Design a protein around this ligand. Structure first.
Ligand SMILES: [Zn+2]
Lengths: 48, 39, 171, 187
């Protein structure tokens, strides 16, 4: 995201990147969010 | 809708920074009214 | 189907003539003899003459005999530059480099002769779009300045906070 | 619509903004009210690239956007977008890019001083004069990090600061003419 903002990347690129960043942060805080995908550990086991 | 906010009066996405700036603009006295200790 | 690919073939023959370089317009019946269209019915030819020949923009009509318009396609680099200037003035937009290439021999040399006056933009299909430069106003932008620009985001700034910043800074 | 406002908008947009966006501002100048689809047709650019530029423009609120609903003859639902430039919004937004440009430069130099002078190669990190002199032992007679056991030189810090100072002066000269245009606008 920092590099995209530095380069002035596409607004939709930055929007999707911010969406993924928000997803990652919220998932780290809580992996049992209602009606949202679960973050696996590349082996099918949901992260704690 | 999931983990994103939409403000509809027409309807636009509400980025976190907007809420951050609004909360910063909020004064300390209003925190007591809202039942949140400012300090 | 019937009576469509034949028209397409005639139009392609016209392009082949233009790769030949025969500016002199030709008779439609002679074109049919060259393209082996005698078998086709006469009524379809008459319908083509009345409607399709006029609709086709590339085709032109002179002294009762049909041929391409030598004015439509670019012939000299100076005229290309003038056309670009007129298009910029009237908001037409740029023209496709593939069409300009088939129009004009050595179009790439023409663009090299243009140099700075002509601005070319790449396209995913590799087609090149050309825009005239503005002589009246010339400005230079440096990369560091553009970066210092780029970081700052007004979208972060809330409109009321905008008018508030002016009022705060006492002006 | 006095010509002075148009002159300000043209000069600022042409000198201190992007060419691809200036292309759209040209359409905005040509017509006060344009359909979004008509803006697309005039622009002759891909929808995705145009929408990226439009999202940037929406964020900066350079041009105000409104939504209008009308019933077509066919009766199928249709959504119609209108974008039009507002001088009052544009003037403040532009002035705002301009103003924060300076706050950035001031913060950069505040940071240059903030950086610590002492730096030690074996350590590979910046060190406070505080930590350095504490690490120093009176019996040994020389200051020197306790941990790495090599001398510390501060000359390396000086160089980049001097380079930045030169850049700032060039920025001032380049930004010197637009202020007169701004003054003509306030007139
Ligand atoms: Zn050390």
């Amino acid at each position: 995201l920092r590099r995209n903002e530095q380069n002035g990347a596409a607004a939709h690129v930055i929007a999707e990147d911010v969406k993924l960043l928000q997803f990652h942060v919220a998932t780290m805080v809580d992996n049992e969010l209602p009606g949202l995908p679960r973050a696996m550990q590349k082996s099918g086991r949901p992260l704690k | 809708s999931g983990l994103e906010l939409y403000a509809e009066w027409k309807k636009i996405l509400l980025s976190p920074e907007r809420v951050h700036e609004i909360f910063k603009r909020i004064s300390d006295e209003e925190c007591f009214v809202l039942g949140m200790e400012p300090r | 189907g019937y009576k469509f690919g034949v028209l397409a073939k005639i139009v392609n023959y016209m392009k082949t003539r233009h790769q030949r370089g025969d500016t002199h317009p030709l008779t439609l019946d002679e074109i049919l003899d060259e393209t082996q269209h005698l078998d086709i019915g006469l009524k379809q030819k008459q319908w083509l003459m009345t409607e399709a020949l006029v609709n086709n923009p590339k085709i032109e009509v002179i002294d009762g005999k049909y041929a391409f318009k030598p004015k439509y396609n670019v012939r000299d680099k100076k005229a290309l530059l003038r056309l670009l200037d007129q298009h910029d003035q009237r908001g037409l937009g740029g023209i496709l480099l593939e069409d300009i290439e088939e129009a004009l021999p050595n179009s790439q040399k023409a663009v090299k002769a243009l140099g700075d006056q002509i601005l070319f933009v790449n396209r995913p299909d590799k087609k090149k779009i050309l825009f005239f430069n503005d002589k009246s106003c010339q400005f230079s932008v440096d990369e560091e300045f553009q970066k210092l620009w780029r970081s700052v985001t007004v979208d972060s700034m809330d409109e009321e906070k905008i008018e508030e910043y002016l009022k705060r800074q006492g002006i | 619509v006095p010509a002075a406002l148009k002159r300000l908008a043209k000069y600022v947009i042409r000198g201190f903004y992007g060419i691809e966006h200036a292309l759209a501002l040209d359409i905005l100048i040509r017509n006060s009210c344009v359909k979004e689809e008509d803006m697309l047709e005039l622009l002759k650019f891909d929808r995705k690239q145009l929408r990226s530029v439009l999202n940037n423009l929406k964020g900066d609120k350079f041009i105000k956007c409104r939504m209008r609903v009308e019933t077509a003859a066919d009766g199928k639902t249709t959504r119609h977008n209108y974008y039009f430039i507002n001088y009052r919004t544009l003037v403040n937004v532009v002035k705002y890019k301009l103003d924060h440009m300076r706050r950035r430069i001031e913060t950069d130099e505040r940071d240059s001083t903030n950086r610590a002078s002492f730096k030690c190669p074996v350590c590979s990190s910046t060190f406070t004069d505080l930590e350095a002199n504490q690490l120093f032992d009176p019996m040994t007679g020389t200051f020197r990090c306790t941990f790495c056991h090599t001398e510390v030189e501060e000359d390396e810090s000086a160089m980049p600061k001097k380079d930045a100072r030169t850049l700032l002066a060039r920025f001032n000269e380049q930004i010197e003419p637009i202020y007169a245009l701004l003054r003509e606008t306030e007139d």
